[PDB]
Each structure stands twice: as C-alpha cells, then as structure tokens.
Amino acid sequence: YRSIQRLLVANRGEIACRVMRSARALGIGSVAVHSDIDRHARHVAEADIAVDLGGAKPADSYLRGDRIIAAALASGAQAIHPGYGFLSENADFARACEEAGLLFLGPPAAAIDAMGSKSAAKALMEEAGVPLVPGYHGEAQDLETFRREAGRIGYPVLLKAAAMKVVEREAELAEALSSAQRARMLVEKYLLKPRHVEIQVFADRHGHCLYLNERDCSIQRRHQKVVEEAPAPGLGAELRRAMGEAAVRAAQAIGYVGAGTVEFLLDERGQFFFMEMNTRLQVEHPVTEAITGLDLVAWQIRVARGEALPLTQEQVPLNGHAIEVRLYAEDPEGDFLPASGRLMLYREAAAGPGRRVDSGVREGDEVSPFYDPMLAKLIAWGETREEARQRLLAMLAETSVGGLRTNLAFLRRILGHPAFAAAELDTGFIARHQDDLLPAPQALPEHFWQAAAEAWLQSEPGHRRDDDPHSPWSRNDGWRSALARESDLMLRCRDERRCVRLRHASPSQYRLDGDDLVSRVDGVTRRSAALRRGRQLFLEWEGELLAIEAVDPIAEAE
Amino acid sequence: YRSIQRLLVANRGEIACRVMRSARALGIGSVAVHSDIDRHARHVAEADIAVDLGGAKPADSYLRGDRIIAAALASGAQAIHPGYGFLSENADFARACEEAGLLFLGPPAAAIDAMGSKSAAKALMEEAGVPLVPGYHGEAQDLETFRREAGRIGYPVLLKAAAMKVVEREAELAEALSSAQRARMLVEKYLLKPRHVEIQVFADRHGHCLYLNERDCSIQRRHQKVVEEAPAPGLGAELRRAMGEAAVRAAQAIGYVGAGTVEFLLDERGQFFFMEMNTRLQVEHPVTEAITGLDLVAWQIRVARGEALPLTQEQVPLNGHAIEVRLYAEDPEGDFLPASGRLMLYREAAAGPGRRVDSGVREGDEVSPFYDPMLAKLIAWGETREEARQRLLAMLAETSVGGLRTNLAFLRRILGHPAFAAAELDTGFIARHQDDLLPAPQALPEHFWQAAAEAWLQSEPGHRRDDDPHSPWSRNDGWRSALARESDLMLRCRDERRCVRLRHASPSQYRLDGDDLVSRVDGVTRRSAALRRGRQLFLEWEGELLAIEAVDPIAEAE
Amino acid sequence: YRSIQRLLVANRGEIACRVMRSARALGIGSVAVHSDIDRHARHVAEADIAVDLGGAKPADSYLRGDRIIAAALASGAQAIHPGYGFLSENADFARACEEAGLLFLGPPAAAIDAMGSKSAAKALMEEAGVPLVPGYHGEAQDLETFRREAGRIGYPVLLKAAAMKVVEREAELAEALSSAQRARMLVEKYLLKPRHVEIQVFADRHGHCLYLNERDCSIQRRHQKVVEEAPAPGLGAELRRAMGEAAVRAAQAIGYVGAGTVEFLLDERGQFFFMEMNTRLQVEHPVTEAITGLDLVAWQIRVARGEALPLTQEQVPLNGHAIEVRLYAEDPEGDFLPASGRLMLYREAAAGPGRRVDSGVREGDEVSPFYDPMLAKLIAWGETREEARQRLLAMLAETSVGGLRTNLAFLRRILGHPAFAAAELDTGFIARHQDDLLPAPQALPEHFWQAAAEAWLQSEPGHRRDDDPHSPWSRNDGWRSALARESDLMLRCRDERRCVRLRHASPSQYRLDGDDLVSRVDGVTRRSAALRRGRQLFLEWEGELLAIEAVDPIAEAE
Secondary structure, three states, X not given: OOOOOEEEEOOOHHHHHHHHHHHHHHOOEEEEEEOOOOOOOHHHHOOOXXXXXXXXXXXXXXXXXXXXXXXXXXXXXXXXXXXXXOOOOOHHHHHHHHOOOOEEOOOOHHHXXXXXXXXXXXXXXXXXXXXXXOOOOOOOOOOOHHHHHHHHOXXXXXXXXXXXXXXXXXXXXXXXXXXXXXXXXXXXXXXXXXXXXXXXXXXXXXXXXXXXXXXXXXXXXXXXXOEEEEOOOOOOHHHHHHHHHHHHHHHXXXXXXXXXXXXXXXXXXXXXXXXXXXXXXXXOHHHHHHOOOOXXXXXXXXXXXXXXXXXXXXXXXXXXXXXXXXXXOOOOOOOOOOOOOEOOEEEOOOOOOOEEEEEOOOOOOEOOOOOOOXXXXXXXXXXXXHHHHHHHHHHHHOOEEEOOOOOHHHHHHHHOOHHHHOOOOOOOHHHHOHHHHOOOOOOOOHHHHHHHHHHHHHHOOOOOEOOEOOOXXXXXXXXXXXXXXXXXXXXXXXXXXXXXXXXXXXXXXXXXXXXXXXXXXXOEEEEEEEEEEOOEEEEEOOOOEEEEEEOOHHHHHO | OOOOOEEEEOOOHHHHHHHHHHHHXXXXXXXXXXXXXXXXXXXXXXXXXXXXXXXXXXXXXXXXXXXXXXXHHXXXXXXXXXXXXXXXXXXXXXXXXXXXXXXXXXXXXXXXXXXXXXXXXXXXXXXXXXXXXXXXXXXXOOOOHHHHHHHHOOOOEOOEOOOOOOEOOOOOHHHHHOOOOOOOOXXXXXXXXXXXXXXXXXXXXXXXXXXXXXXXXXXXXXXXXXXXXXXXXXXXXXXXXXXXXXXXXXXXXXXXXXEEEEEOOEOOOOOEOEOEEEXXXXXXXXXXXXXXXXXXXXXXXXXXXXXXXXXXXXXXXXXOEEEEEEEEOOOOOOOOOOOOOEXXXXXXXXXXXXXXXXXXXXXXXXXXXXXXXXXXXXXXXXOOHHHHHXXXXXXXXXOEEEXXXXXXHXXXXXXXXXXXXXXXXXXXXXXXXXXXXXXOOOOOOHHHHHHHHHHHHHHOOOOOEOOXXXXXXXXXXXXXXXXXXXXXXOEEEOOEEEOOEEEEOOOOOEEEEOOEEEEEEOOEEEEXXXXXXXXXXXXXXXXXXXXXXXXXXXXXXX | OOOOOEEEEOOOHHHHHHHHHHHHHHOOEEEEEEOOOOOOOHHHHOOOEEEEOOOOOHHHOOOOHHHHHHHHHHOOOOEEEOOOOOXXXXXXXXXXXXXXXXXXXXXXXXXXXXXXXXXHHHHHHHHOOXXXXXXXXXXXXXXXXXXXXXXXXXXXXXXXXXXOOOEOOOOOHHHHHOOOOOOOOEOOEOOOOOEOEEEEEEEOOOOOEEEXXXXXXXXXXXXXXXXXXXXXXXXXXXXXXXXXXXXHHHHHHOOOOOEEEEEOOEOOOOOEOEOEXXXXXXXXHHHHHHOOOOOHHXXXXXXXHOOOOOOOOOOOOOOOEEEEEEEEOOOOOOOOOOOOOEOOEEEOOOOOOOEEEEEOXXXXXXXXXXXXXXXXXXXXXXXXXXXXXXXXXXHHHOOXXXXXXXXXXXXXXXXXXXHHHOOOOOXXXXXXXXXXXXXXXXXXXXXXXXXXXXXXXXHOOOOOEOOEOOOHHHOOXXXXXXXXXXXXXXXXXXXXXXXXXXXXXXXXXXXXXXOEEEEEEOOEEEEEEEEXXXXXXXXXXXXXXXXXXXXXXXXXXX
C-alpha cells in the first residue's frame, strides 16, 4: 500500500480544479503546474503549491513531461494525476513517472500504447469478445468476393479504396462494384443513425474490474462531444450489461488499472461496436458520478494507493438521470471557431437542487488562444430525465457570459428542442437540426431599446458630490418642471445605434435591483438579467446576452 | 404524458410562495397573478413572471377565473395550480382550464362539485363503505319510531327539527320526545370529545391511490384549524389503516386524481365518521411532508404531467412527529378579529434542526383587510412528539412580530400547556382551556421599565458629528462628574407611561448586541429580544412583544 | 416519564458549549453557571441563562454543589448535566440533586462511589466476569509461595512491597525473591506494550444496556490522553465483542444508567484487563459519535427523561474511522506546563468534509491558570483510517494559535509520524518517539526573514490622509527614482532580531491576501499563513507559528 501526501495535477483549467477538489477532500495536498500564461490562473490559485513550467504553447508547456515530473519531485508530490488531454495517454510519460517512484493515477503504460494503435487494439479486442465494426481491408477482389464479404457485414454497407459508395441491397451490389478510377476496393459496414454509447470502466490493482453504467454522447458539434447523459436514454437492462461486460472484458484484456471508458457505437438495430478506449478519466464523467454518488477522482486516487474498489457490480448504483453540457468560447453562428478574448462578464448559476458546475474560470480571466476554450461544464441531475433537462435548462438561463462569443445560446436551444426532449438521438443530431439550433438575428424591437435604455440609465447613478451629498440634482430621474420626465440616451448595441428617448409622466415601467431588470409591460411583470461590467451593459434578451454601451460622439468622430 | 414549462399559481400569500418553491425545484418556471393591492407582494416578487388581475376584493381579483386563465395563456403557462381557498374547488373553473388546454393540478371537475354537495356526497360515500354520522331526516314520528332510530345511532344522541335536546339514556327518551313549539323532530348522533382526524389522500391518473398517513387538527379557534399534527397522537396501526382505506375508497369512489384529504371525526369510542373531503391540497400539508419526506406539490405536479405515484402503500413512510402552527394577524384576547395593519417588525426563527416555516410575508409588508390574515405556518419536526413540540415552541420564542396584534402569544401558550403535552385532544380544547390560553395583562413591574429604559437608551446612540467624530460627548453613558451616572427617560408602553430614571455608579447591569438585551439581575445573566424598528422599541417580556416609544411632550400637548 | 424544559450544565469550557448545543437541538433551554473569571466566557455567552457561582479557584466555584443546585432551582432548570471533571463523579452531588427533584444526567449515585473505590470495585468486577490485573497483596511469603502465584500471573511479572524488580523467567525468580531492605513482597503482573482500549457503555432506566464500540487512547503525555481513535486500529470483531460484553456486564453489575466507559488495557498478547470505569461521559466521546452517527448527549438527555435506548446491540453502527486530538495551552519542548495567557490569535479550520471541532474558546479570550488548559478538540472522520488521519492533519495545518505556547506543533508531528500511521500503538508511544515529537529550534534562515519582512511590510499599509486620500505617497512600495525599490525593516522574532533590507527591481516575489502569504521562490508558488493581530505578525513557518514584531528603538533603549 503506497500513500499520497501531495498529489500533483499535471493539467489546467476545469479538470485541474476538479481533481484538486477531491484531493483536498481527502486531506491530500495538491500541486499545480502552469505555463507562463496561466501564471495567474484559477487552478494555480486553488493549489497548495504551484510550479512554473514552460511558456505559452502546450507544445513547450504542459506537454513537457520531464519538467512536470521534475516539478513533482521538487514540490514533494508522491503521485501525478494527468487529467484528460495533454499527457494523460502516452506510456512514455507514464513510464517516466514510474522511473521516478511517482504513482501515476492512470492505466499501466502497457494498455496505453496498446490501445493507442488502431491495429494491435483491434487485435486484443477480438480476442476478448468485443464486437468490432465489420470491415474488409487487405484483399480487394471484383464482382464476386465482395458479395460474400458484404453479406455478413450487414447489407447497409459502404465501399472505400486506399486513400464512399453506400450499398443498400445485394441487388445494388452489381453496379456498386464496377467503379474504380483516379478493383482496389474495401468493404466497411455503414451504420444507420448510430448513438454514441460509452461505458465507464474502472478497475484496481487487485484484478477486480467493473463498469459504472454507460453514457450517451451523441450530440456532437462536428466531431466533439457537446452534450452527455447517463444513463443512455433508450437502452434497457440487458443491453446495458451486454455493453458493460464487453467493455469490462476489454479492460481485463489489456490488464487495465485505473479509470477509463470504452467508446462504443450502436445503430438503430441494437448492435454495438468498439471504436476506442480512453486510457484516462472521461471529460463527461460528472453525469456518471451524478447517477451513482461516486467520486471517480477519489476512486482514481484510492486504486493508485492500491486499495480495492469499494463495490461489486451488484452494487454499482444507477438512480435518476443527469445531463451534462460543455460551455465553450466558440461561436454559435460563426462556423464554430475558438473565440479567445476576455471574460468581461461571467456569472454562474446559483447552487440549487441537482445542480453542479465544474469550471476553471472566473470573471476577469482571459481566454487564451493556446488551450481548449472550455469555460465550464454544467451538470443537472433529476429524478426523471425531464427533470435533469428542465433543471439544466434553468442553469443555462441563470448563466451569463460577456466579452466573448459563447456556445451558450446554442446549448440553451438544444436542451429546449423538441427533438432532444423526445430523445431522438444519433450522432448526426447536430448537423440535422442546425436550422433551429443556429438561427439568425432580428435587429431587436423598439420593445428592446426602451428596455436597454431604462437599464443603462439606471446603472448610471448621477454623481453625489462630497460638496452637497443629498443634492436632488443627483437623480437619474429625468425630472422636468410641469411636463413629463425626459431622458434621452445615445445607445449602441452590437453594430447598431438608437437614440432612445425615455418619457414617462408615469414613474413606473422599469426598476432594477442587483442584476435583475424588473419590467412592467402593462399587466405583465417580467424580470431578466441586466449586468453592468465597466462601460458595458449586458442585457438578457430572448435567451441571448446583448452588450450595450453609450455612443461616444468624440471617440468615433475621431 | 403532457409537460409543464411554466406553472401558473392562481393564488397568493404563503401558499403561492410555497408552490412556487417546488416548481423552481424542478426547473419549472412560475407565473404569479395579483390584485392591485398585492402588486408589490412577496409572491409576486419570487415569481418569474407576474400578471395584474383585478383590484382589491377577492370577489373581483383572485376569484376572476376568466382573467386568471387568460393570464396563463398570455404568460405562457402550460398548467395551473390553484393552491387552497379561492378557486381551488369549483368545477366551473376546473372545466374552464380544460377549455383552454391548461393542465389543472387538482381533481377532475366531476369529483369537485360531487363532493361539493352535502347530498350526493352522502350518497357516494355510503356506496363505497365510508361511515357517515348516523342521522334521521325526512320522517319525524312521535314517541315510538325515534326509539328504534335512536337505538342504532348510539344513545348519546341529539334532537333537532327543521331550521338541541341531548338525549343520554333510552329512559330519558320519554320526555326527550314530547317537546315541540315555536312532532317535527330529527335524530342526529351526538359525538363525545371528538378528535378531528383527516387522511392525506393522493391519487394519479393511472387509477392508483393511496393515503399518506393522517393528521389531527382538533385544536380549532371557533371553527378554524389552529394547530395540526401528524401523526394523530393517539390512534395505532389498525385505526390508521382503517381510516386510510376508508378515505382511499372514498377517493376511488369519485375517481379522484390529485391531492386531497378526507376529513373524519372520531369520538372517544373509536368510531370515525366522514365530514367532507377537500378537493385541493390541505393547508396543514407540511406536517405530513415532515413525517414522510415527500414534496406533495412536486407530486401534485407530477400526476398533472401524468406520471404514476412513485410509491405503493407499503412504502408510504411515517417516521417521527411534526407539529404545525398557524400565525395570524388576529387578536388573542380581543374576541379573535382580523387585525389588518403594517408589519413594523417581523423576525422569523433561524434555520435549525427540524425547523420549517412557510410564510408569505416580510418586514414592511402591509396586512390588507381583504385576505386571510395568515402570516406564516411554523412547522417543527422531532423524533418523538415532545421533540417536535419543544422545538416548535423554541421557534415561537425566536419569532417576533410588531405593528399588529398577533395570535403568537396565544400559540406559545398552547404548545406550552400541560393539556396539550398530554395530548388531551378533542375539538373543544380551545374553548375549554381558554382561561389559561387568553389571560389578561398585569401592568408590568418596575422590574420591566428599568429593562425597557436601558434598552431604549442603548438603541439611541448619540449623534456623532462630522465636526468632531470622536467627541466623548456622544456617550449615551450618563456620565456625571463626581456623582453617579444619571439618565432620565420619558417612556410610554401601550397606554401607560413612566419616567424611568437610570442610576448606576456600577456601569454593569445591561448591555445590548444585535437584537438581544443582555441583563444581569445580580447573579442571573438572562437575555431577551429587544428590536428597534423606527421610533419604536419592541421588547420581549414574559412571552409577549411590547412596543415601547419615547413620550413626545409636544406631539401630545397638541 | 419526566421531561426537561431547561437543562443546567454544571461545567465550563468546551464540554459546556458541547452539551448546550445538543440541548438547543432538542428545543431544550440551557442554563450555565460561572466563576467570576468566566463571567465573560463563551459557554456563558451561548447560554440561554447564566448564573454567577463562586470566584476563581474551582475549589470554591464550579465545585460548590450547593450553589450549583441552588442555581438550577432558581433558573428553572429541571435537570443537571455535569459534563466531565468537577462534580460529574461523586454521589454526594448526585444525591443532592435527587434531594431537589432535579434529574441528573449521570449514573445513579450508587455506581458512582462504588466504582470510586479501588477495593469494592475490584469486588463487583470479579463477580461479573470482568478480568482484573492479576496481583497478590495481603500475603508476602519468601522463596516458594511466589513461584506458584507468579506462575498463574503470566511470567512477565513485577515485584513490589508496601509503599520494581521485573521478573522475566521462572529461572530468574530465584534472585528475584532474595531482595528486601530499606520478605514483605507483592506479585503484580507486568504488561508488555499495552494499548489503552476503553468501551463506550450506555444504558437506560429500563435495564437495557449496550456498548458503542471501543476507543483507543494509548498516546498519552505523561499520563493524560492526547490522541484518541475509534475504532481501536488493531483488534477485530471477536476481541471487540469480548471487551464490549465485559464492559456491559460491568455496568449491568452496579446497575448503571447513563453514559460511561470502561477503561481496559490489553498487552501484545490480547488479554484485556479492567482499570476503572468513568461514571460520566468521556472527553474523547466525539470519535465514537463520528463512527456511529449518534449524539451521546442527546441520548444522555433521553435516558434522563426515562426513554429507552433507540437501538439493540445488533444495530450499534461502526462505519469509517475518526481520530481526535486535544489542543492545549501546554508547552511542547517545555516539560509540558500549563501555559496560561491571552489568545492573541485563534483561527480554527474551516468546515470541510469529515471535519469537527469542539472548542470552548474564541479569539481574545484569556486562558486562566485555574482550569484545564484545553482549548479545543479537533476530530476528523474518514472512510479509512488514513483518511481520518490525513484530514485531521489538514485541520491542524489550517489551525493557528498565537499569544501562548501550544501543543499544536506537537500534535501535528504525531499525526505526521510514520510510527503513528503504522498504528504502532502502546501507552509508551509518547515517551518513546519524543526525540522526533519534541525537536529543537534552528534560528530560521535568511529564507525566512525575507518572507517575514515582506509579510509585515504588507500588513502595514501607509496612512491615507483625509487631506489627500489618493496620495501616491501612501505606497508601502519602496519606490525609488532611477534605482530599485528600497524598504528596510527592523524586525524581531522570538528573542532574535534582523534588519531585513528588501530590494527588488522586480515588483514580484510576495503578495498577501487575507491571512495568506503568497510567495514565489523562483518557479515555486507556495502559500502559508500570515496573520496580523495587533502589533504582532504571526507567520506559519515549517509547521510552527512564529510571532514577529517591529523593533522599537525607544521602548528598549529605555
């Protein structure tokens, strides 16, 4: 039994804070490492000790194993957690840790580069009884061998070469074959509306291994998990234990030790195929923890120390439903591009029932163009799936982010999409409903400018002079003698500008407390977000944060 | 399966906030509606969206169905919860909601007006095997038919006509009959020291139905529940399941769907009789939730959405004891009258163990003369009943309310009454011990004025002038040269006034921090409430809040 | 069934606050009593009512039964809890309470003075089948009787007289006997590396009795429990139930009622012997509560009221591990002496997972030379024992205490000692590893003074004058014209003084927020405690709080 006194977390952002929280929960000290850019980061801040690594690019910063392990030796860390990304999956680094006496909360180096090759991994998988996507490389016959090959591979089959021709019937296989240009043809099975189902595997040193239910990660933005959930909405008990056992046999196969997940893919027809196993902890791991009450990082730490998994498979719980969403600094209707800037506004959503949020940022922080733009992960748990969904949706309503372009408006729509409620999931969901997910702006109504004006005007007190502190002249009132209150504002939202003239012989209409604009459109009292950060007023309007500011005649004239 | 996005709560005060909290807990948006008087109310405040209805009287405000349903359509509510009171029990409104596509978290309109008639309800009840209070209308014979009738109705029987003559023995029935004036005689059973026991029923759409234990609501101020508890102190397992099944058969009878309770009545002899069923959620519902860990409003919402009750009767828990008390703006020793004014002081009691408080007010709020004067409901849970009682009592000690007359001093006495500890309950408890519950004032001792003075004097700093900020002249000290500290105060409590002269060559005695007056009556250091709100000092004295203020020679001389 | 309305706690410090918290948790009012010195104490502060007793020495203060019981009658207390120490174990006081109608949350007076005599207690114990340490008083033969006596007493035996000669073999017994001077010889069994294992017993009035697992309290500073844990690290199920039953039979024996523990002693050989039973609640009781989820004071209160223990022995839980440490105002490397002074600095460690802390002090409080110098008890719970240990260690890291000498540095070392992790426990542990537990100072490195200076300088702003509030002259910067920032400080730590000269053409290095000094020793960002209290700066350095202050040329020259 070894034992960690200080755990070094060789990573950054959300995940670094994430692991660090679990360490702390056990009385274990935490060590962070940072590039020069993250010198003033949150993960470095919440760390008991930090150590400066490289400079800016991950290439010569967080990827510098030798320095990371050096740091660990110097800062007195007895173990290393690599979190996901970076060096979490490359035996070289896993071995170098071994060649240092450092425990490595990960799978033994072997399993790593073994699963790192499409080849040998395809090998070990078949051996353990893990279904693989029927294919047919090597040989490339003509109008006769393919017929037999294709026949077993299920007929909804594809046709490639050596660098598509979707065959649907054996009767279409005829012309399907006589097509070669630019003979040499491959027979790879094509999958219909396939859901991405992975299984959370977790072993220990004592040969025990188990799967902690499965997660669906179908909704993906041009390859890249955007939403995750556990359990997988559709499949029942049998299908679960089938894929779980498969994954468990897959891990037993390469003698796995830590946490990792087997990433499958199952069509509309229930057949599930191995795609690849992640020899690290999964990003979307929170939804699993949600429905199981388990701290996978704690577990991750315990096996490292060499203890035995606290449960048997008959005990792995699975109650309720939890949905996870990834908040990025991407651009919704902007071809999704790593928008890196400054977080002028960043308000997370209050603690509340099944609410969880694993972030790595805070207001004022800069989103550098050197790392994954993931701001935070919002997770909601619910008894039913509607609950988790409706809760998660509320967490997205109560979250605002300004100073950057965010995939937040996008995510709000997804959870609030009839398609998503109905669980009509497959890995093409994103590109399918894109028209509803990535709309296009509507100039804003006079309904809006009045609201924005009121808001701004009320976020701009009036200057109280020490000379005369209670001067009625400090009113942002608009008071006029016999006529009605007049206030005129030159506002500019986005790349548009209006000259809102506020008039009201009726003091009512709008008020504003904290970060809430309380409006009264004759009869209906509604309240929305209105947050002032600097010379900017971020207003919540139709589920989209709009930045408003005053026009500066001088600035621009220049 | 339908599904609520926004839930409109067609009600106000405590219950409105109550339901709204559950909605929010599920990620469901909430819509409020208000009269013009409640335009600035707490329930409107804690609402995601509010809508102005009528004006002042419930008649043309919260009772205006057409507008309430209009509001719901306009504000985007997919369902309506009517809470208790108002329109929560009248098929007309329940149907109008149906004729709008709105889900109505309540029983189907049928059961409503069916149970709304003493007649037809008496019908359906007998049919389902629900005991009714033996009576004898219709026929009115003389000295012979009554003998047989009375004989079955149990002899402790009453005698009415067509608009009392308590018969106790068959041998007294003789003269009991020859009395008619102003022949036409009715034979209705009389009940001895009857406890009010109701059962919390809750069905769904799928025909399932169950009872969630029972509640005793015996202690009533001239008809009106004042205290409630669950479970009913006396009765055991058999009696519980008997009344429960009875109530469940009663609900199955009219095809009930939501939440509701069957209100029974059982004498000293264990026989229980149906009185009426409430086709809504019960006000005193918190004590039930307390001993069951169930959110009846959540459940209420779920059946509306059409899900199935999450439990079977073998699972309905029942651990511990919970007591509920109703805080009103009534007048203890003032013939109990709807005292409507301004809440100058309103301090609830800190969160603590089994403590719960469902209110609908806050300091500064006005208690209008248009609605039920219920301020809040204080609920305490305990393992035993003494625990709940002692805790609840502590919550009443730590609660202060000034600017109005309150039934709070009254309630404190009830929980602290030997009769109530001993569970000597029957529906006459209130009018019986009235002498101990509604005492009569004692002028206050010189013991008091000294205390009040010290308090006031210490709630009145001394004016620090910007001219000279640390001036020793700001001391509320009473400093005198060689003699002892002299301070004289002209105080007036209630309709009495004293000229407290504070002298002390001993700086000690009293001090005051926050809302606590710490006194030291030579040897005994005691601490009580002393809260300053405006030109008024509310002091806790002998379990009764006393308002104290300074006498104004000018004001009155005028 | 009697019932407490107000509970008087006849004690002080931590335990008084401790019991008072449980009372409050049940809605039970609490009454405190104090000496004149504790007139402004925390336990008196957290009390609903307090009563002045004696003056300074416990002799004529908390030990004055007559006054304590008088107080209880006067303050309206229906019961008395004596906590540990003082009068918690002396039938005289227990009887006097009886002769007053006061419930006494303790064992019936009988058991008290019965267990109070080494004699009669040795009697009752043998009768109930409770092993005792084999001895041999009365008779004192020569070279023949001892041989037989010694033979049964296990040969690792001692030899005393009437006021040591450790015999190890029967073959050594020869010369072992012919030694008498200054015949009259006693034969008492000697124990090898004995662990101190006591069992938490708890009965009621209804004859039921049970043991709530055991606690190990081996690590003791020259007789005096310093560390405690539950369960006892080594022993298994059989040994547990054996000692438990023994203790239970011991309590049944004298007809015990409340809480108490049987203090055993078991050698390396597994044989356990009775030492004495405490007829009160144990100080170290929190570790037991930790691993059982039980409030022993609540229980203590309930049996007093005459209820029946809520569990059977098959239910007494035992999950996880909890370690308790006693924080005293002793002197680590100062021959352990009751250091009584003023708590200039007292910061407990934040609420966190298995964290618990039962204290009786607060910053500013004076540690009088009249009572047990125990500041607080820090308890950490963990799933495994390493967890509890590592957590508890973190609680000791996050705890600072200045203005006195504290056994805190000592305790930190114990939990962080390889010997303690390995559970190498026996009652000699303290005096054995003393060399590692009570080191000796090392003057502090230039590494330190730079740190202390920076800290001090940064805890000393610069004086902002109302005259000119933003004056750049307020910088504690060290700004110099063309050269580098110069700041010179005359600091004095302990009885040493340096003239730290801070120079930095690099603004970086140190910063300071809250009570954290964030340092950057080129590459490694570390953070430690630095708390300013008055003209003193308490810095955390190498797990030892160092007091630093500025040298005053005038003060000393004088």
